[PDB]
Motif scaffolding. Structure first.
Motif, PDB file in Angstrom:
ATOM      1  N   UNK A  28       0.825  -1.205   0.000  1.00 56.01           N
ATOM      2  CA  UNK A  28       0.000   0.000   0.000  1.00 56.01           C
ATOM      3  C   UNK A  28       0.864   1.262   0.000  1.00 56.01           C
ATOM      4  N   UNK A  29       1.960   1.261   0.761  1.00 55.60           N
ATOM      5  CA  UNK A  29       2.880   2.395   0.763  1.00 55.60           C
ATOM      6  C   UNK A  29       3.500   2.599  -0.614  1.00 55.60           C
ATOM      7  N   UNK A  30       4.012   1.522  -1.214  1.00 50.51           N
ATOM      8  CA  UNK A  30       4.627   1.631  -2.539  1.00 50.51           C
ATOM      9  C   UNK A  30       3.614   2.093  -3.575  1.00 50.51           C
ATOM     10  N   UNK A  32       0.910   4.054  -3.323  1.00 47.37           N
ATOM     11  CA  UNK A  32       0.697   5.493  -3.209  1.00 47.37           C
ATOM     12  C   UNK A  32       1.955   6.276  -3.567  1.00 47.37           C
ATOM     13  N   UNK A 279       5.803  12.863  -0.809  1.00 47.43           N
ATOM     14  CA  UNK A 279       6.940  12.455   0.008  1.00 47.43           C
ATOM     15  C   UNK A 279       6.612  12.455   1.492  1.00 47.43           C
ATOM     16  N   UNK A 280       5.911  13.479   1.959  1.00 44.33           N
ATOM     17  CA  UNK A 280       5.657  13.644   3.379  1.00 44.33           C
ATOM     18  C   UNK A 280       4.283  13.149   3.792  1.00 44.33           C
ATOM     19  N   UNK A 281       3.523  12.571   2.860  1.00 44.64           N
ATOM     20  CA  UNK A 281       2.223  12.000   3.197  1.00 44.64           C
ATOM     21  C   UNK A 281       2.155  10.536   2.756  1.00 44.64           C
ATOM     22  N   UNK A 282       3.217   9.793   3.038  1.00 39.19           N
ATOM     23  CA  UNK A 282       3.225   8.347   2.911  1.00 39.19           C
ATOM     24  C   UNK A 282       4.086   7.833   1.778  1.00 39.19           C
ATOM     25  N   UNK A 285      10.905   9.812  -0.085  1.00 40.33           N
ATOM     26  CA  UNK A 285      11.781  10.968  -0.011  1.00 40.33           C
ATOM     27  C   UNK A 285      12.866  10.857  -1.074  1.00 40.33           C
ATOM     28  N   UNK A 337      14.337   2.896   0.812  1.00 38.07           N
ATOM     29  CA  UNK A 337      12.913   2.563   0.806  1.00 38.07           C
ATOM     30  C   UNK A 337      12.392   2.136   2.167  1.00 38.07           C
ATOM     31  N   UNK A 338      13.270   1.724   3.074  1.00 40.14           N
ATOM     32  CA  UNK A 338      12.843   1.193   4.354  1.00 40.14           C
ATOM     33  C   UNK A 338      13.746   1.650   5.477  1.00 40.14           C
ATOM     34  N   UNK A 339      13.754   0.908   6.590  1.00 40.80           N
ATOM     35  CA  UNK A 339      14.510   1.328   7.772  1.00 40.80           C
ATOM     36  C   UNK A 339      16.010   1.413   7.500  1.00 40.80           C
TER      37      UNK A 339
ATOM     38  N   UNK B  22       9.617  -3.814   9.154  1.00 43.93           N
ATOM     39  CA  UNK B  22      10.116  -2.538   8.662  1.00 43.93           C
ATOM     40  C   UNK B  22       9.220  -1.453   9.249  1.00 43.93           C
ATOM     41  N   UNK B  24       9.505   1.819   8.903  1.00 41.11           N
ATOM     42  CA  UNK B  24       9.282   2.938   7.980  1.00 41.11           C
ATOM     43  C   UNK B  24       7.997   2.760   7.180  1.00 41.11           C
ATOM     44  N   UNK B  25       7.841   1.603   6.531  1.00 41.92           N
ATOM     45  CA  UNK B  25       6.715   1.423   5.617  1.00 41.92           C
ATOM     46  C   UNK B  25       5.392   1.342   6.360  1.00 41.92           C
ATOM     47  N   UNK B  28       4.543   4.970   7.538  1.00 44.33           N
ATOM     48  CA  UNK B  28       4.098   5.848   6.458  1.00 44.33           C
ATOM     49  C   UNK B  28       2.688   5.482   5.993  1.00 44.33           C
ATOM     50  N   UNK B  32      -0.693   8.160   6.479  1.00 44.33           N
ATOM     51  CA  UNK B  32      -1.603   8.561   5.411  1.00 44.33           C
ATOM     52  C   UNK B  32      -3.010   8.024   5.641  1.00 44.33           C
ATOM     53  N   UNK B 177      -1.078  16.287   8.881  1.00 43.85           N
ATOM     54  CA  UNK B 177      -2.321  15.586   8.608  1.00 43.85           C
ATOM     55  C   UNK B 177      -3.180  15.531   9.868  1.00 43.85           C
ATOM     56  N   UNK B 281      -6.069   4.174  -2.054  1.00 40.01           N
ATOM     57  CA  UNK B 281      -4.804   4.803  -2.420  1.00 40.01           C
ATOM     58  C   UNK B 281      -3.849   4.811  -1.225  1.00 40.01           C
ATOM     59  N   UNK B 282      -3.768   3.680  -0.536  1.00 43.27           N
ATOM     60  CA  UNK B 282      -2.747   3.439   0.467  1.00 43.27           C
ATOM     61  C   UNK B 282      -3.272   3.402   1.886  1.00 43.27           C
TER      62      UNK B 282
END
Ligand SMILES: Cc1c(C(=O)c2c[nH]n(C)c2=O)ccc2nnn(Cc3ccc(F)cc3)c(=O)c12
Ligand SMILES: Cc1c(C(=O)c2c[nH]n(C)c2=O)ccc2nnn(Cc3ccc(F)cc3)c(=O)c12
Ligand SMILES: [Co+2]
Ligand SMILES: [Co+2]
Lengths: 381, 381
Positions: A28-30, A32, A279-282, A285, A337-339, B22, B24-25, B28, B32, B177, B281-282
């Protein structure tokens, strides 16, 4: 020089498979962040008691995200009775991969004419087997050999949508995102020693070295006959003043693995506008932009290829530019992409080498190392 | 009846910590999907060589997402020299938790007056210790005892932003958000046997049973003195025609654990509009809506509380409604948050019991089981 020495018939990159701990959240992250549509699934709702697998697509680009369920759900199965849609999958292998490397690419899959033949010839030529050829619903054959670290090269061939046992995703659940990404251009590995890695992979594929033109790396690119399957490999350069990012990768990844995926955009300006909005909403970066000196120096290097406005549009978005003797390359890099500071993504667009566009038109941006250094020091003073 | 028997002074829910592969994912995606801001971090960039931890906030709601790095990064450390910001963290425990349960809640954290006292009294009263009290930078004390399965109840107390060693997230990386979520209302566990679970938890906390009013479950709610810390627990009911969702949870989760988190919204209509816009959308999906019969029957049950238009607004969004003798409850449930049919989220808003609003005003919607059955059968014929 291209000796066209492929030992079996190779077509195109087919898909990239990430091994995850939770496939849902990564996918879902990827989706979006990159504007990729949910297009197929294989999971509990399709009868798969073994693994959850979700496929994202954008153009011809296929990202697959897979995670294991509890082994207890399938403890009564054997390989002949498996409900897994990817018969190479193994709970223990997947858990060991993710706990060792964190989130990353398990499989670089290329489509071939005959996956059983590709497997046999590969192994006859030094490839370390990983999963023997298996025919799925008498329609698709899949086979895997080791590429580097715990990454496999996966061969897929079709008699004649993704794989049998995958179901097309209901369109209510499938929002048609699209930021312009169209296909995988290249997939790059980091290893401790480039020489033995190249010798091994070129040895069993017949892929040839793609001609190029203190940055931390030595590299070389292996390519198929028509140079549309492009597999660069890096090794670190030690002793430098600045620590090699390849060495940082190896340390945090616990050894060799896939460093970056380069995704071709049919409109890199649209892609980067859309990705940067998120970038900053899911989303993802991007690495810090080059100083304006870099963009001042772009007139002298590509002023015949990009207008002043197009150069201005590069500067707004942080896009980098490099040039071959044959083509021009526009590129930019995400943060990891991750930690872990390991895998990242490159967005690229290539200008030139029209015949269709020939593979690798413009190179891979090796000159942007030199140019980044110069521009940075120039901006300071 | 509220005997106010807390064995130590309890304030409010402080945070929920997810153990991830992970961080991070997941963070994020949650940010969102739920409209929660990135507000603090503890990771490689803050000197933490042990774990990556990212904090999301919305109002007073605090979601923490933590994943382990490679143990090699910290192999030279000992507990006295640790760079972890959460000293209870253990690589092996985290990897074992995630591989056993997949993505889920490791810690339900409540703020108390004195975490060392809360730990000592708890353990003196049957609590199974998990991590002894530890004073962080002479400012914050943290301690953990087992709650159920591999979930811990975490005590946090402050002498006098999140925890020492966490850094406030740069505002460029922090997009504000907000879909209206304001605090955690309750956190619900699934266990194989309700009786022994209740006896244990009420035994070491002094929390009292919160009075309520073939659905698959028996349940009971434990509550602190002012009934703002609310911990419901479910057990499955076996033999039913339809398989108990509590039993499905236990099977796919590999045993007891946290079933759902109920998040209070100050405007459930805005929250659900915003969340539903992002489902494909995520964000998060919602359970299938009740049939229009359910909303036809809402006039007779809450027509004195909600206008016809407000009832219409519930129907558009799939919101459910229940009522106590003291208050009215609006609620809705997401689909599972990750790959497994285990943890999900409830969004709620409570109407009534003004004194401030008293905790648990309106109950927990137990009547909506009965009402869903009736409405479904009514719609059919
Ligand atoms: C990844 C990359 C490519 C690339 O994609 C390929 C190069 N050779 N081949 C075969 C490729 O595919 C080309 C030019 C580049 N110029 N600067 N930087 C900045 C940087 C970021 C982090 C760090 F630790 C050190 C330096 C890049 O990362 C960069
Ligand atoms: C979770 C929930 C609550 C709830 O939140 C609490 C109930 N007691 N306590 C202490 C609570 O906090 C209240 C009413 C509900 N009415 N219908 N459904 C539908 C359903 C979905 C999947 C499945 F497998 C079976 C049935 C609910 O899930 C539901
Ligand atoms: Co590249
Ligand atoms: Co609830």
């Amino acid at each position: 020089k291209n000796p066209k020495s492929d030992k079996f018939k190779v077509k195109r990159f087919h898909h990239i498979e990430f091994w995850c701990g939770d496939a849902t959240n990564v996918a879902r992250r990827f989706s979006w962040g990159l504007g990729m549509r949910f297009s197929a699934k294989s999971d509990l709702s399709t009868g798969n008691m073994v693994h959850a697998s979700y496929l994202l697509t954008s153009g011809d680009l296929r990202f697959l995200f897979t995670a294991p369920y509890s082994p207890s759900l399938s403890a009564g199965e054997i390989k002949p009775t498996t409900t897994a849609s990817i018969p190479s999958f193994d709970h223990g292998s997947c858990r060991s991969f993710f706990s060792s490397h964190g989130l990353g690419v398990r499989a670089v899959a290329i489509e071939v004419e005959d996956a059983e033949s590709a497997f046999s010839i590969s192994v006859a030529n030094g490839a370390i087997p990983s999963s023997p050829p298996i025919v799925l619903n008498e329609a698709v054959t899949i086979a895997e050999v080791k590429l580097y670290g715990d990454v496999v090269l996966r061969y897929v061939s079709y008699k004649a949508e993704f794989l049998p046992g995958f179901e097309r995703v209901e369109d209510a659940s499938s929002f048609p995102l699209d930021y312009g990404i169209r296909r995988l251009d290249h997939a790059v590995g980091n290893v401790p020693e480039l020489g033995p890695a190249l010798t091994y992979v070129a040895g069993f594929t017949g892929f040839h070295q793609f001609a190029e033109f203190e940055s931390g790396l030595n590299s070389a690119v292996l390519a198929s006959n028509d140079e549309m399957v492009l597999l660069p490999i890096n090794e670190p350069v030690h002793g430098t003043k600045r620590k090699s990012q390849i060495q940082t990768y190896l340390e945090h990844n616990e050894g060799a693995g896939l460093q970056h995926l380069a995704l071709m955009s049919e409109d890199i300006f649209r892609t980067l506008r859309e990705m940067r909005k998120r970038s900053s909403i899911g989303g993802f970066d991007f690495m810090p932009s080059p100083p304006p000196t870099y963009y001042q120096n772009l007139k002298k290097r590509v002023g015949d290829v990009l207008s002043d406005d197009q150069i201005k549009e590069c500067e707004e978005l942080g896009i980098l530019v490099d040039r071959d003797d044959q083509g021009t390359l526009l590129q930019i890099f995400t943060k990891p992409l991750g930690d872990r500071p390991t895998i990242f993504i490159e967005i690229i667009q290539r200008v030139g080498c029209m015949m269709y566009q020939s593979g690798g038109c413009g190179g891979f941006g090796k000159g942007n190392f030199s140019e980044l250094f110069k521009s940075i020091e120039e901006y300071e003073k």
